[PDB]
Amino acid sequence: FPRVKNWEVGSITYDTLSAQAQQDGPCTPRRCLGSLVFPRKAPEQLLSQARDFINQYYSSIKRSGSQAHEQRLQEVEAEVAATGTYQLRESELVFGAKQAWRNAPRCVGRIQWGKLQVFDARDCRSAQEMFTYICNHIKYATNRGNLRSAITVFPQRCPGRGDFRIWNSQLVRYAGYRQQDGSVRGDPANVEITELCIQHGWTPGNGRFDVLPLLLQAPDEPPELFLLPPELVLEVPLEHPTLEWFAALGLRWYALPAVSNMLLEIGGLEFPAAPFSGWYMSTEIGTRNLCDPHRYNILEDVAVCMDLDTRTTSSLWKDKAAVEINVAVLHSYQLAKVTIVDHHAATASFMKHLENEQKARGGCPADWAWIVPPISGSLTPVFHQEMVNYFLSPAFRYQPDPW
Amino acid sequence: FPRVKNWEVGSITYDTLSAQAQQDGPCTPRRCLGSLVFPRKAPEQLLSQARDFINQYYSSIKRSGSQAHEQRLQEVEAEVAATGTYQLRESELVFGAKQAWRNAPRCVGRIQWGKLQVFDARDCRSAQEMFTYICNHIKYATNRGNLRSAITVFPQRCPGRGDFRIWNSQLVRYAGYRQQDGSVRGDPANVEITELCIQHGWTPGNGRFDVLPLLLQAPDEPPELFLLPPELVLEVPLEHPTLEWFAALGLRWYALPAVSNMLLEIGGLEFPAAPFSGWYMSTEIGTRNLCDPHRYNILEDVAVCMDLDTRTTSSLWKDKAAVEINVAVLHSYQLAKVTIVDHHAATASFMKHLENEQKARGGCPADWAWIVPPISGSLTPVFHQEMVNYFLSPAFRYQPDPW
Ligand code: HEM
Ligand code: HEM
Ligand SMILES: N=C(Nc1cccc(CCNCc2cccc(NC(=N)c3cncs3)c2)c1)c1cncs1
Ligand SMILES: N=C(Nc1cccc(CCNCc2cccc(NC(=N)c3cncs3)c2)c1)c1cncs1
Ligand SMILES: C[C@H](O)[C@H](O)[C@H]1CNc2nc(N)[nH]c(=O)c2N1
Ligand SMILES: C[C@H](O)[C@H](O)[C@H]1CNc2nc(N)[nH]c(=O)c2N1
Ligand SMILES: [Ca+2]
Ligand SMILES: [Cl-]
Ligand SMILES: [Cl-]
Ligand SMILES: [Gd]
Ligand SMILES: [Gd]
Ligand SMILES: [Gd]
Ligand SMILES: [Zn+2]
User: Fold this and answer.
1) Catalytic annotation on B305?
2) A285 within ligand 3 shell (Cβ under 6 A)
3) From CA B100, how far away is CA B393, in angstroms rounded?
4) Which residues pair with A176 in a beta bridge?
5) By the 8 A CB rule, do A234 and A145 touch?
6) Which among A296, A279, A278 is positioned nearest to A287, based on CA atoms?
7) Neighbouring C-beta atoms of residue A33, cutoff 10 Å
8) Cβ(A381)–Cβ(B294) under 8 Å?
9) Residues that bind heme b, according to the entry (chains A, B)?
10) B149 phi and psi angles, rounded to 5 deg
11) Nearest partner of B228 among B174, B177, B281, judged by Cα
12) Which numbered atom of ligand 6 lies nearest the CA of B369?
């Protein structure tokens, strides 16, 4: 049981939950690979995962060992013997989606894990129905700016049949267009998906913030292009409370972070299409998406407008510009009445989550490099908190791109 | 071998050097403990470490497999067989100290590793002579503000005789006077050594920046107290280039960071007293030493003086105040003509070091959580660089406090 110290307060806890970690991570006693973005590259197998998930479920409602518990176990055995897979009950699906969020080591927003609206799309057939489910998800989750966490679960992977897939990494993304000079207009992160939408009959734009169409794939068909109704896509124009020229930069971002390319795993079952959404932490937009060198990379543009000395690093012009961009993001979302959390509030709430999970489960899997914000790291309490990283199931996992 | 990606550029390398890591870290496939501050707490074993070190030395001078190489291996074998231990050649000590710096995974300053002045104090016989060696180190390293990297190596551990130890964690440290109510005047990081200095006869001050005396331990001797000559301790008063009231805070810091409590290990030999010094990166002073809540904790006082709204996190008052404190540190050291490096220049130079080391050795041990600076993390290139952490020897290691 690893001993874990908070260096600000000097308090000590022991992570006993890490002993339950099912899958193996990339580290060994010889070398630590904790900084890697990607840590990883039949009925007998499925059953053991399914059994252990059912046990988790009945334990969490204080009915482990019950007659209902035995009945459910024998149902999944007969299902898998007949069909090669099995079906989750509605409450098991809800429990599993929430646990997968709860177990996500890189998520700083997990204080909210018990509040998640689960939309059951497992009856879906055809991309046209997918689009309708997705549109209802966006409508519900946006809620005129009063954002609400939600997940929509499309049919599970099964033998001899293709997957439902959302090709887009998020439900809302901005196009990125290349030119002869190899540069990108728009989001460089989305160049690949932008040319895929083009290579499927989308008329591109010429803007820095053109909302991409969706490429939805029903099993064993090619993907189909769908355009999001523009009144479903809430956007926030960015302005600054005191720097009046900031608005003239024409920056904007979208309200709803809706991740659509991860795989949800519950009880050995795999849902390759299960988009989930919550709300943004301000540094995601103001520091990463707008200031990363391989994203919009606007930091020097802002610093020039601020009349800062960009010819020496020791003026900290980068740090001053970054703070004002994050201010503009917070100010703009609050003025537009769109839910947003700043990095100080979010890390404080994660510390409370760590304390709750110590009491509830004996620990909490956490990835320090992703929990600590990308600006002002040591000014937040999570910086001073030792963390144990490990993989529990149910889980959200990376998966190969469809193409 | 681990594949390692730079996400800013997209470039990929393989860390083949990690396969040579001898001593084991705390991670397993089950759980990663990379964020823990303390990862770690016989003639045949000595010979294999010595042999490996001698091989490194003769490779470094392009004389591997030479007669001199084979004769030195046999010479070390003979000495170990006769005495249970052996002595380094002067050239080996210089090389080994530079290698231990080169191997230190938490050091962002390793672009400099080949420029190190090595003072051989292995003939030291008393705490008084230890003090003379230390004063000459400080004088050389400080160089009237044009700081020069240096290490002084005191005699190695040997059986039947106690260790040389410097009890202080650095050669220059400010007193921390612990109060009644758990408050502290001065540096809370130094409460323990301050109380030990008083218990050994030091007459304490009552200021916030009182330089501590040295507690120097000769073999099998109680520690002995030595006061540093004031003219040897260069200090920098802190002012801000445009906030004139900042100088009235009365803050100062010292020029020379000189770590004195780590153990230096070379070829299986152990040097428990081997203080080393370089120069500061400005975030160590401006962000950690002055803004950590458990150190000088000046953030709120500065923010209030700046007229920031400290009642709401989303004003980013903490971020704005921390930037100006870091500006003051850099401005003050530059004005005093004392060497200092900002975190943008340091991390840029560390990226150059990684490229050099990939070519030279096929990898570089690096601790991402310590390499990324405590403010403005993703504004520096190291944030976007995957890193592999592992332990090579020669090495600097933590060791228990001698009291
Ligand atoms: C409610 C507000 C939420 C906030 C403020 C939040 C915040 C964050 C942040 C800042 C990250 C790091 C992502 C990055 O840097 O790319 C993250 C990761 C993650 N979040 Fe949350 N999140 C929220 C809700 C949710 C929900 C509702 C789910 C799923 C039900 C979820 C699942 C995940 C997962 C799986 C990751 C890891 C993603 C990866 O490894 O790339 N989060 N979250
Ligand atoms: C020349 C300028 C140098 C700079 C700017 C520099 C910078 C740094 C910084 C910022 C850290 C992190 C320290 C912390 O956050 O507590 C560090 C760690 C370290 N440095 Fe360097 N350093 C320099 C020279 C040296 C030298 C000369 C040596 C030894 C010969 C050295 C050995 C180490 C070691 C062993 C660590 C790890 C300490 C630990 O694990 O607690 N550095 N350095
Ligand atoms: N682009 C690449 N990099 C890449 C690879 C893996 C991961 C990532 C990071 C993208 N995380 C998006 C994300 C995930 C989870 C949370 C958030 N934030 C939020 N607040 C929420 C999103 N939903 C509800 S809350 C944002 C980037 C590629 C690599 N290989 C081909 S593409
Ligand atoms: N309180 C504790 N703190 C604590 C524990 C472990 C580590 C640390 C960090 C100390 N790093 C000081 C340090 C080391 C190396 C480099 C630098 N910087 C520099 N630029 C230089 C110093 N020389 C040349 S360059 C600064 C602090 C305790 C631990 N266990 C019981 S208490
Ligand atoms: C190389 C490194 O692991 C990578 O850049 C990580 C670091 N920490 C992160 N932290 C968050 N929240 N999001 C990220 O994308 C990353 N990227
Ligand atoms: C818990 C965590 O490991 C600890 O606070 C570390 C994080 N990264 C650090 N990085 C540096 N350079 N110095 C530090 O003291 C720390 N502290
Ligand atoms: Ca000899
Ligand atoms: Cl995003
Ligand atoms: Cl220090
Ligand atoms: Gd061209
Ligand atoms: Gd102007
Ligand atoms: Gd002024
Ligand atoms: Zn690890």
Assistant:
1) no
2) no
3) 7
4) A186
5) yes
6) A296
7) 24
8) no
9) 107, 398
10) -70, 140
11) B174
12) 8
Instruction: Of B350, B339, B329, B338, give the one whose Cα is nearest residue B287.
Output: B329
Amino acid in position A202: W
| Domain B235-257+280-345 = CATH 3.90.1230.10 | yes
Return the SS3 of B375: coil
**And the tokens for B214?**
């040295």
Strands B276-277 and B395-397: unpaired
Report the SS3 class of residue B105: coil
Contacts of B307 in chain A (CB under 8 A): none
Burial class (CB in 10 A: 0-12, 13-18, 19+), A343: buried
Token pair listed for A269: 């079952």
Asked if the peptide bond before residue B394 counts as cis, ω within 30 degrees of 0, the response is: yes
Residue burial A305-337, b: 16+ Cβ < 10 Å; e: rest: beebeeeebbbbbbbbbbbbbbbbbbbbbbebe
Chain B residue with CA closest to A345: the answer is B313
The answer to whether the CB atoms of B28 and A31 lie below 8 A apart is no
A93 sits in the region (left: phi over 0; alpha: psi -120 to 50; else beta) called alpha
Q: What atom of ligand 5 comes closest to residue A35's alpha carbon?
A: 3
B263-266 and B269-271 as β-strands: parallel, antiparallel, unpaired? antiparallel
Name which of B16, B184, B319 to mutate to probe chain A: the one with the most chain A Cβ atoms within 10 A of its Cβ: B319
Judge whether B343 and B369 are in contact, CB under 8 Å: no
Secondary structure of residue B12 in the 3-state scheme: strand
Nearest to B28 among A29, A35, A287 (CB): A29
**In contact, A96 and A267? CB cutoff 8 Å:** yes
- The answer to whether A165 is a known catalytic residue is no
Residues in chain A: 403
For ligand 1, whether the C-beta of A391 sits within 6 Å is no
The position carrying tokens 């874990």 is: A4
In what order do the strands lie in the sheet containing B276-277? B117-120, B150-153, B276-277, B258-259
Whether B311 and chain A come into contact, CB under 8 Å, resolves to: no
Please answer whether residues B271 and B153 qualify as being in contact, where contact means their C-beta atoms are separated by less than 8 angstroms: yes
A355/A271 Cα distance (integer angstroms)? 31
| CA pair distance A129, A161, nearest whole angstrom | 18
* Peptide-bond breaks in chain A following residues (C–N over 2.5 A): 41
Sheet strand arrangement including A269-271: A269-271, A263-266, A395-397
CA distance B239 to B333: 10
Length of chain B measured in residues = 403
List chain A domain ranges: 15-122+149-159+263-277+347-371, 123-148+163-234+398-402, 235-257+280-345
* Closest listed residue to residue B379, CA positions, set A316, A37, A306, A238: A316
Q: How far apart are the C-alpha atoms of A144 and A142, rounded to whole Å?
A: 6
Phi then psi for B244, rounded to 5 degrees?
-70, -25
Query: For residues B228 and B214, is the Cβ–Cβ distance under 8 A?
Result: yes
Residue corresponding to tokens 């490996």: B52
- Report the 3 state secondary structure along A315-344: HCHHHHHHHHHHHHHHHHHHHCCCCEECHH
B3: closest chain A residue by CA: A36
| Cα separation, B133 vs B150, whole angstroms | 12
Instruction: Copy the structure tokens of residue B362.
Output: 């096929």
What are φ and ψ of residue A70, in 5° steps?
Answer: -70, -40
At CA A286, angle to CA A282 and CA A287, rounded to 5? 105
Record: fold of A15-122+149-159+263-277+347-371: Nitric Oxide Synthase; Chain A, domain 1 (3.90.340)
Beta pairing, strands B150-153 & B117-120: parallel
The resolution in angstroms reads 1.9
Can B107 be counted among the known catalytic residues?
yes
> A250 near A75, Cβ under 8 Å?
no
Instruction: Give the type of residue at B177.
Output: Y
Per the entry, the structure determination technique was X-ray
Q: Which CATH class is domain A123-148+163-234+398-402?
A: alpha beta
